[PDB]
Every structure is written in structure tokens, then in C-alpha cells.
Structure 1
Amino acid sequence: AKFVIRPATAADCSDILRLIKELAQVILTEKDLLEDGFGEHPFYHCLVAEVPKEHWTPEGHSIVGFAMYYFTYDPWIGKLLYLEDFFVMSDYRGFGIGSEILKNLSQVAMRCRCSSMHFLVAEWNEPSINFYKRRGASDLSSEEGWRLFKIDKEYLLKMATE
């Protein structure tokens, strides 16, 4: 199908949520997406793929893919573009949407002068691993010995009132 890649706008929040859930507990609401993505200080940025009516989803939707990203920083690497999620609806793959999205993400990285694009991949997802390796990716966690940790809300609360 004919498609165009463009930045998401506040009007696209319901579609972004639809796509997140399709990519998928998702407890994020449309209201969160609007408040967090379109205020003076946005916490994420999104590129979406839009198709014309002859190709709308059965449900009658025009957005069929997205890439959610944001900028991060590492004192010993550089400014970085962090790719949080990337998803194209099954029936809309094979027409170049993903390749155009990755192309535009890369151009954005060049504009921001980012030294690298970072993202996570599950250790057992060989297909995804090889898709990214074919594009020059390296498993930083394994090569340099880095593990990802988290501290959840119940713990943060205890320390914040302590």
C-alpha cells in the first residue's frame, strides 16, 4: 500500500495506544500518551506510518506502524538515540515501511549528532538479533559485561519517605 512516515501528533494518541497493545499488563492510557508526549517537555517521540483509506485496517484505522524513541546520554559514548519500540502491523510488512522508518530514525540521529542508537533485544530472539546485526548492531551487554537492573515503585516510595 501507499504509506507515509511522519511524526505522531497529539491526535494520534489513540492509534499509538492501539499499536502498543497490538505489539503486546499495558496500563498506559491514551491520556498518559497525550500528557507525556505533547507537553512542553515530551518524554518520548514517535514516528508513525499512515496509509490511505483503500488500505485502512479492517477496523477502519489509518496508522499501521510506529517507532517510539527518545534521546539519552552516556558520558563515555555520546548523545544517543534510544529506540524503545518498533512495530509494523503484520499485514503491512513487506512494502518498505520498516526500512523507511529505520532510515528516518537514522537521519534523525545524524541531525542530533548522536554517536549511536541503543535498544534492547531479548537474548533468545535470534531472528531479531540477526536482523539488527545485519545492520551493524553489537550486543553491548555481552561484549562489555553490562546487566540491566530496575528498582520498582514500592521500593522507590520507601526510599522517598525515609
Structure 2
Amino acid sequence: RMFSRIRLATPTDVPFIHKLIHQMAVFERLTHLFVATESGLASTLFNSRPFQAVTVFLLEISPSPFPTTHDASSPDFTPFLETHKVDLPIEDPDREKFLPDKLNDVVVAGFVLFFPNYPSFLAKQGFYIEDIFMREPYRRKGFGKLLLTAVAKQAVKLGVGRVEWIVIDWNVNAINFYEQMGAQVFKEWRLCRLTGDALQAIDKLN
């Protein structure tokens, strides 16, 4: 029997966020683009109230109950706490890198990083999910479903009209998860990008 908590990330979680994004870059065959540093994440992730700009939920797992929220401090968000019967003991070789406190038995298992977007045809704010990821030892136990559900629940609270993200078409396992969650994966849309260098080249135009 296992316990999960979905909570907002704080500055103390930067090492875990950094490592999770790195794992994403490995999976997406894009380590050459991964230049993120802990210092860069610390400088950019926590300069607004949650949900108004870039926001992170972390999913934690423990064999012990978490402290109960009892009385909320937050106007917007209280952690989601759930109990689980999993059919298999978890072998997690990276556990030591994902402990918020090395003296407590709470492990960061996954995350979602998202921010407001704007579906213009609706004239409403939405959310965009930039990252959603469960570390390998914790997959196929319903945890990814909970991370996505947490975003949806916050979206409803805030009157969000749509959530979007992107996927590499060759990421079959992720696509299957998204489809089983009720997402549509479009055939026709393509991503366009101006890199930092491309931006500099335009800025030098007379």
C-alpha cells in the first residue's frame, strides 16, 4: 500500500525539476538542446503567484501517510492526497536523487509544468502543458492520470477553456496515454520555431 501527494513545487524543488526535465530531454532525443541549469530554473520559475504564469505540480510517493492539510493556507490550491494498492514492489535505482528530505521516505515520482495560453477562437484563457512526465519505476499505476487530472481540475476552477500540449509522433506510449485520457492528437498541425539565434538575426534587421 502506497500514498501519493500532488502539490505545487517551490524553490526547494529545483534539483528535482532539473533532473526531470533532463530525463524528458533524453526521452525526446533532444539532449543537445538541454541547456537548463538549476540556477536558471530558480531565476525563472517562481516570480508569480501559482497559475498566473509558469506553474509546476509534483507527484510524490511514500509508504507512509503524508501530513494532512487540516487547515488550508492557500486561497487557490490544496494538495491532492490518495491511497493506492499497487500490485508490484517498486525498484527505483534513482530514488536518492528524488528525495526532498533524505531523512524522510517521500520520493518525487513525476511532474507537470504548465502555464496560461490563449485559444483565440474561444476568446478565453487556457493552459498549455509544457512537460508531463512520470519516472519509469512509477509508470502504469495511475499516477500520470492523476497529474493530468490535477491540471484539469485547476483549469475548471479558473474558467480555462482548453488545454493543449505537443508530442513527437513517434512517442507511441505517450500518445496512447493521452488518447486514453480523452485527448485528441491531431494529424495536421506542425510546430514552428524561432531559436535564440534566429531571433538575434531578425533583431539585426535594419
Same fold (TM over 0.5): yes
Q: Check conservation: 1:49, 1:63, Cα contact below 8 A.
A: yes
- Give secondary structure in 1 for the equivalent of 2:112: strand
- Give secondary structure in 1 for the equivalent of 2:153: helix
Q: Check conservation: 2:98, 2:109, Cα contact below 8 A.
A: no
Determine if the alignment matches structure 1 residue 31 to structure 2 residue 32: no
Partner of 2:87: none
Determine if the alignment matches structure 1 residue 124 to structure 2 residue 170: yes
61-70 vs 119-128, which moves further: 119-128
- Note closer, same or farther for the CA distance 1:161–1:107 as it changes in structure 2 (3 Å cut): same
- Note closer, same or farther for the CA distance 1:126–1:60 as it changes in structure 2 (3 Å cut): closer
TM-score by length of 2: 0.68
- Note closer, same or farther for the CA distance 1:35–1:67 as it changes in structure 2 (3 Å cut): same
Determine if the alignment matches structure 1 residue 159 to structure 2 residue 202: yes
Coordinate RMSD, CA, aligned = 2.4
- Note closer, same or farther for the CA distance 1:11–1:58 as it changes in structure 2 (3 Å cut): closer
Partner of 1:72: 117
- Note closer, same or farther for the CA distance 1:60–1:120 as it changes in structure 2 (3 Å cut): closer
The 2-side partners of 1:9 and 1:49 are apart by 13
- Give secondary structure in 2 for the equivalent of 1:75: coil
Partner of 2:78: none
Alpha-carbon offset, residue 96 of structure 1: 3.1
Which one-letter code corresponds to 1:147 in the other structure?
A: R
Unaligned 5+ residue runs, structure 1?
A: none
Partner of 1:106: 152
Alpha-carbon offset, residue 131 of structure 1: 2.2
Alpha-carbon offset, residue 69 of structure 1: 0.8
- Give secondary structure in 2 for the equivalent of 1:3: strand
Q: Check conservation: 1:36, 1:43, Cα contact below 8 A.
A: no
Alpha-carbon offset, residue 27 of structure 1: 0.7
The 2-side partners of 1:97 and 1:139 are apart by 21
Which one has more relative contact order, counting CA pairs under 8 Å at least 6 apart? 2
| Alpha-carbon displacement from aligned partner over 1:70-113 (angstroms, at most 9, x marks no partner) | 11012103321111111111112244321221221110111121
- Structure whose residues are more often helix by fraction: 1
Unaligned 5+ residue runs, structure 2?
A: 27-31, 65-89, 100-106
TM-score by length of 1: 0.84
The 1-side partners of 2:131 and 2:5 are apart by 19
Number of residue pairs the alignment of both structures matches: 159
